[PDB]
Amino acid sequence: DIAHNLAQVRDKISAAATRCGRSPEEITLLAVSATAPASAIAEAIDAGQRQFGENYVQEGVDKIRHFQELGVTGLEWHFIGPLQSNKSRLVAEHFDWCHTIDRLRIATRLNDQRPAELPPLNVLIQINISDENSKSGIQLAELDELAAAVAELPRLRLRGLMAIPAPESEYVRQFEVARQMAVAFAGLKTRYPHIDTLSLGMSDDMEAAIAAGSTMVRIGTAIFG
Numbered sequence: 001d002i003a004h005n006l007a008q009v010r011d012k013i014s015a016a017a018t019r020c021g022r023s024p025e026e027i028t029l030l031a032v033s034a035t036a037p038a039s040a041i042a043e044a045i046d047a048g049q050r051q052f053g054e055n056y057v058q059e060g061v062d063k064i065r066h067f068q069e070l071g072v073t074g075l076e077w078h079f080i081g082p083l084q085s086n087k088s089r090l091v092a093e094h095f096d097w098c099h100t101i102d103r104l105r106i107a108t109r110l111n112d113q114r115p116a117e118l119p120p121l122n123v124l125i126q127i128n129i130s131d132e133n134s135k136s137g138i139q140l141a142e143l144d145e146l147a148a149a150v151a152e153l154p155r156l157r158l159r160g161l162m163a164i165p166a167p168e169s170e171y172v173r174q175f176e177v178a179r180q181m182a183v184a185f186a187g188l189k190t191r192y193p194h195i196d197t198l199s200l201g202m203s204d205d206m207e208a209a210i211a212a213g214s215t216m217v218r219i220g221t222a223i224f225g
Contacts, residue, residue, distance in 0.1 A: 002040060003047035005223045006031070013217060016210040027210060030078055030199070032220030034059065038066050040224055050074055053099075053218055055081035057090045064094045080162075080199075080218065082136050089113040092155075097122040099162040099199050102138050104149050111153035120157040124199050125150065127184065130177050131166035140184055151192060160197035160215070161185050165205070174208035182213030 006029075014024040033041050034055035041052060041063060054060030054077065064077050078097040083106055091098055092113035101107050101123045114121050125146055128137030138146055143161075151158045161184060165177045181200050189195040201209025201217040209217060 002043040002223065005225075006044060006047045006049055009219050009222055012206065013210070016207045020211045022210070026215060028197075028216040030080075030216055030218045031223050032080070032202075032218050033063070033224065034081070034220065036220075036224040038063050041067070044223065045072060045075070051076040051078065053078040053080040053220075057081075057083075057087040061090050061094045083110075085109055092121060093118075095121065097124070097159075099124045100126045100136065101146075101150060102126045102128075102136060104146060107150045107153060107156060111155045114155035116155070118155075120155050122159045122197075123150065123156045124160050124162040124197060125158070127161055127163045127181060129163045129165055129181055130168075131164065133166070134164065137163060140180075143184060143188070147188060147192060157194065158192060160195050160199070161188065162199035168205065171208055174205040175212055178205070178209045178212030178214065185213065 010029060013027050013029055017024040017027050028051060030051050030053045031044055031049050033052045060079060067075060076096045078099060079091050079095045080099045083091060083100050085106060088106060088109040092110045093115060098121060110121060126137040127140060128134055147158060150156060161181060163181050168174050178200055182198060185198045197216055198214050199216045200214035203219055203222045206217050
């Protein structure tokens with residue numbers, strides 16, 4: 001049952017925040033609805049969930065159009081998969097957030113393809129903080145330069161950072177890696193305006209991510225099976 005699962009995930013988020021002295025409202029639950037059908041998303045919507053993350057552009061755009069045409073208002077769609085230049089226009093035209101900025105060219109394409117009537121597309125710069133098998137995300141040493149370039153794009157809004165750490169079973173390493181991100185996030189927040197989003201943590205490392213300073217957790221399986 002999707003509604004029961006949302007309540008259970010929101011409980012674990014709330015607990016983890018309270019345990020480390022944070023208000024549960026500091027943590028956004030991003031429901032990863034990739035691979036789940038629109039009908040299941042509609043259950044989640046009926047249970048109050050409003051922010052959904054999609055990994056593939058056409059799947060995501062199809063859901064977005066479906067709920068727009070039902071007249072369901074008030075949703076926030078996050079594109080959280082790797083973005084190819086030949087699918088940027090679809091992201092720029094339909095999504096509210098994109099978590100995977102790791103190249104200036106893709107950010108500029110998104111900016112150019114974003115209709116002017118829409119709010120600026122909220123973007124996070126993706127850091128490859130610890131995963132040698134992934135080619136997604138930049139190194140931290142590239143962050144200052146990329147952030148400065150991205151920040152000038154008027155149809156984008158740089159809101160913070162995202163990372164997908166390498167899989168890790170030890171809580172200690174989960175926390176230390178998440179802290180590296182939180183430190184980078186804090187440093188960015190001092191110089192840049194409206195830095196408020198650290199997209200960090202999934203089901204298996206949710207507690208360490210929240211203890212370290214994440215503002216947004218991405219949960220898929222635990223919600224949609």
